[PDB]
Amino acid sequence: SGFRKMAFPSGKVEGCMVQVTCGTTTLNGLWLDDVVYCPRHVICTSEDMLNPNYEDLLIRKSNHNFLVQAGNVQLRVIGHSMQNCVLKLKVDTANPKTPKYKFVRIQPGQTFSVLACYNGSPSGVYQCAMRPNFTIKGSFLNGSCGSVGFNIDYDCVSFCYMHHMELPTGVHAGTDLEGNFYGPFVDRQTAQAAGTDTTITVNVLAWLYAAVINGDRWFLNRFTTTLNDFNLVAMKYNYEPLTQDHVDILGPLSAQTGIAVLDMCASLKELLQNGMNGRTILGSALLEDEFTPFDVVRQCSGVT
Amino acid sequence: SGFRKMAFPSGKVEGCMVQVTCGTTTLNGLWLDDVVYCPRHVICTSEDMLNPNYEDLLIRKSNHNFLVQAGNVQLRVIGHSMQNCVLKLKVDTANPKTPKYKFVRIQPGQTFSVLACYNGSPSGVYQCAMRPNFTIKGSFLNGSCGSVGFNIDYDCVSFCYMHHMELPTGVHAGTDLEGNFYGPFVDRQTAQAAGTDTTITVNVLAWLYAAVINGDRWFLNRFTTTLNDFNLVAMKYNYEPLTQDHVDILGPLSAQTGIAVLDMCASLKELLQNGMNGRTILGSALLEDEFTPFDVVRQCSGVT
Numbered sequence: 001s002g003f004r005k006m007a008f009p010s011g012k013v014e015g016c017m018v019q020v021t022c023g024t025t026t027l028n029g030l031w032l033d034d035v036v037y038c039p040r041h042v043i044c045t046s047e048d049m050l051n052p053n054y055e056d057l058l059i060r061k062s063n064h065n066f067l068v069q070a071g072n073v074q075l076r077v078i079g080h081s082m083q084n085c086v087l088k089l090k091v092d093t094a095n096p097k098t099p100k101y102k103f104v105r106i107q108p109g110q111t112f113s114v115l116a117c118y119n120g121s122p123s124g125v126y127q128c129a130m131r132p133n134f135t136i137k138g139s140f141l142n143g144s145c146g147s148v149g150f151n152i153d154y155d156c157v158s159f160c161y162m163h164h165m166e167l168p169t170g171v172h173a174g175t176d177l178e179g180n181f182y183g184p185f186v187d188r189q190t191a192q193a194a195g196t197d198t199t200i201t202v203n204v205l206a207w208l209y210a211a212v213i214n215g216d217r218w219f220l221n222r223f224t225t226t227l228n229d230f231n232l233v234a235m236k237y238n239y240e241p242l243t244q245d246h247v248d249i250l251g252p253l254s255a256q257t258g259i260a261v262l263d264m265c266a267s268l269k270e271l272l273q274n275g276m277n278g279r280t281i282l283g284s285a286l287l288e289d290e291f292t293p294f295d296v297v298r299q300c301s302g303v304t
Numbered sequence: 305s306g307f308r309k310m311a312f313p314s315g316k317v318e319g320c321m322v323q324v325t326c327g328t329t330t331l332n333g334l335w336l337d338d339v340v341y342c343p344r345h346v347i348c349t350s351e352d353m354l355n356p357n358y359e360d361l362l363i364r365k366s367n368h369n370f371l372v373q374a375g376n377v378q379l380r381v382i383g384h385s386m387q388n389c390v391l392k393l394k395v396d397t398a399n400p401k402t403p404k405y406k407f408v409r410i411q412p413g414q415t416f417s418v419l420a421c422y423n424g425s426p427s428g429v430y431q432c433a434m435r436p437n438f439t440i441k442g443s444f445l446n447g448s449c450g451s452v453g454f455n456i457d458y459d460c461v462s463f464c465y466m467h468h469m470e471l472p473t474g475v476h477a478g479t480d481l482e483g484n485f486y487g488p489f490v491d492r493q494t495a496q497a498a499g500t501d502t503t504i505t506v507n508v509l510a511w512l513y514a515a516v517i518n519g520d521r522w523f524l525n526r527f528t529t530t531l532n533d534f535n536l537v538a539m540k541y542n543y544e545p546l547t548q549d550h551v552d553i554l555g556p557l558s559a560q561t562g563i564a565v566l567d568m569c570a571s572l573k574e575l576l577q578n579g580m581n582g583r584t585i586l587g588s589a590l591l592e593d594e595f596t597p598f599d600v601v602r603q604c605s606g607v608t
Contacts (some may be wrong), residue, residue, distance in 0.1 A: 001444070002474060002475075002476065004418075004441075009314045009315075009419060011313075011314055011315030011426075115313060117608070118606045123313075123607060123608045124310035124313065125313055125429055137587065139603060140306060141605075144606070171306075280590065286588070299427075
């Protein structure tokens with residue numbers, strides 16, 4: 001029993017982290033096969049970041065200006081190219097620790113593990129969600145850029161995120177591993193405000209199912225609702241609309257607990273309208289939305 | 305910026321996890337040098353667990369009855385001994401991935417990372433604290449026994465916990481790596497009730513300092529207090545007493561923020577007496593107590 005905010009084991013990703021230095025900027029790179037992926041803003045001074053022209057800045061850079069260090073050993077850069085907002089540094093050595101991997105672009109509400117790195121060295125691992133406004137709420141200090149987000153399916157690492165930016169509001173923005181930002185953000189130090197950080201309704205419902213499985217049941221009530229009725233209340237509380245697709249995804253948790261998805265929606269509706277009244281659910285005073293239905297099934301079944 | 309519940313990178317520990325089978329019981333082992341450490345209840349049927357005599361049960365066990373598998377390769381057991389509540393299986397091969405390590409016995413309030421494992425295979429990593437009642441609130445299903453808790457200091461893994469037991473209340477009990485239970489618990493399926501789960505005051509204070517560093521300041525007030533006055537309120541709210549030792553440990557966070565420890569105690573006192581009034585601190589509606597002062601400094605400075 002028990003239900004924890006749980007990250008994927010980080011070993012396979014730790015084996016991929018390198019240090020990338022260009023001039024006075026040091027950040028992290030991801031070494032897969034004979035390519036090191038890093039934020040293209042490695043080429044920028046903090047002055048450059050105010051209004052960078054990346055193509056023009058890159059003209060002044062050669063392979064030998066990109067210093068790539070894997071532990072205490074230097075990698076030889078034999079080529080470089082810009083793909084969207086990432087640099088791809090071709091090196092002369094294939095990473096011997098390259099895991100099976102994919103690059104995936106996740107949707108808002110999807111969770112992933114972040115391995116926070118400084119100077120190519122892992123400091124910690126935590127679980128995140130892609131927010132409905134395409135930010136993440138991470139823990140990233142100067143030097144953490146190029147830290148990556150990932151899911152693991154048995155032995156295949158799916159890389160979904162690379163850290164680039166902190167907004168003036170202290171929330172985080174980055175790219176997939178093809179260098180495309182999540183949401184409308186750009187790698188420029190400018191007025192970038194996030195939209196509404198809505199709650200990921202399907203994730204809250206999953207986590208209420210996790211609570212029932214684990215013996216926290218006080219919030220179950222005698223009511224049901226409809227998707228349309230629930231969605232009026234969701235809208236009022238800045239929750240994401242619930243779709244039949246979400247109801248379908250929750251079906252296995254519904255089956256296991258014998259609680260119809262719409263009954264659990266009616267419990268959530270009362271919690272929104274009534275509050276927690278100083279009670280907790282799985283040790284939380286607010287409704288947790290950074291567990292997907294897949295996460296709840298995985299953790300409640302002990303997948304490795 | 306940002307502050308996350310962060311586990312140590314798990315790679316060094318992943319390299320140590322093995323499967324241990326005795327008869328029909330499979331659980332996890334920790335392979336360091338040529339010794340595999342596992343809960344001695346690997347020798348028990350669920351029937352045995354009601355009233356086990358471990359010495360008597362062990363007489364019927366030989367080296368060849370302990371099946372140790374590291375990935376898909378079998379290890380040869382050349383000896384076995386019982387130390388307190390753990391078995392030490394001597395194997396003929398030193399773990400080639402053995403990290404620098406220590407065995408430490410932590411105090412209540414100390415945090416650590418758990419690598420949850422099933423069948424010798426890591427499923428996830430999360431952060432825990434040793435509760436003041438010597439339980440932990442983990443996420444452990446059948447098969448998770450022998451999963452370990454650890455801290456890392458640069459490249460040295462300090463192992464502090466091995467998972468043994470779930471109490472009927474769904475909280476967790478285990479041993480240090482010398483096989484001594486934390487608290488009064490035993491490896492027997494019997495009435496074992498935990499004492500009061502008090503809040504780790506020094507950890508809450510650390511986390512309020514983390515909040516200030518990260519821009520969450522609404523709870524700072526115009527008041528101060530004394531240790532004796534604060535401690536009357538702590539006692540009323542089932543918080544651990546604060547000692548001058550705790551004040552000393554918080555000194556660096558006091559220095560960095562310019563908030564005297566006793567001023568932060570006065571903020572905590574008002575939060576206890578007034579509640580959160582539906583507000584959050586670092587995304588939490590309750591006061592977090594699973595960050596040590598060392599954890600806050602580490603995460604706020606980006607140690608690797």
